Amino acid sequence: SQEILNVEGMSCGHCKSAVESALNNIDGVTSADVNLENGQVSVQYDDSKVAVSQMKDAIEDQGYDVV
Amino acid sequence: SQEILNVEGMSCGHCKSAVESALNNIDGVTSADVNLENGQVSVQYDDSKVAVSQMKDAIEDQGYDVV
Ligand SMILES: [Cu+]
Ligand SMILES: [Cu+]
Ligand SMILES: [Cu+]
Ligand SMILES: [Cu+]
Ligand SMILES: [Mg+2]
Ligand SMILES: [Mg+2]
Ligand SMILES: [Mg+2]
């Protein structure tokens, strides 16, 4: 499954790495790709293992806003 | 001694942390304080031990531009 989340506050490569790392530490997330130019975060996942709510919380816990 | 560097590209707390760590790794740098709001980086150092050239290089090696 794929989810595209729109995120505010990611301003550089360090933010990209923080977000991708946080998402990839969740069991069930297969990969994550931040696009800093448009704020889009694309998550590939097993939808029997992880909910989108968990993705949003992981990102917000890193200090960003899911919009 | 005190040096103020003007640095472009620091966008967030991760950038701040990276710049301060790189500077504090240099022998003779006592402390470093990034102001993200104006790009100024204040470095306290022993001017017998460290040159400003070493500070600029450390910053530019982390990917930022020193003015
Ligand atoms: Cu950043
Ligand atoms: Cu950041
Ligand atoms: Cu940053
Ligand atoms: Cu950064
Ligand atoms: Mg969906
Ligand atoms: Mg993983
Ligand atoms: Mg030190």
Curated annotation (Swiss-Prot), chains A, B:
Entry-linked SUPFAM superfamilies: HMA, heavy metal-associated domain
Induction: Induced by copper and, to some extent, by ferric and lead ions.
Location(s) in or outside the cell: Cytoplasm
Gene Ontology CC: cytoplasm
Stored PANTHER family: P-TYPE CATION-TRANSPORTING ATPASE
Record function comment: Chaperone that serves for the intracellular sequestration and transport of Cu(+). Delivers Cu(+) to the copper-exporting P-type ATPase A (CopA).
Name used for this protein in its record: Copper chaperone CopZ
Species this chain originates from: Staphylococcus aureus (strain NCTC 8325 / PS 47)
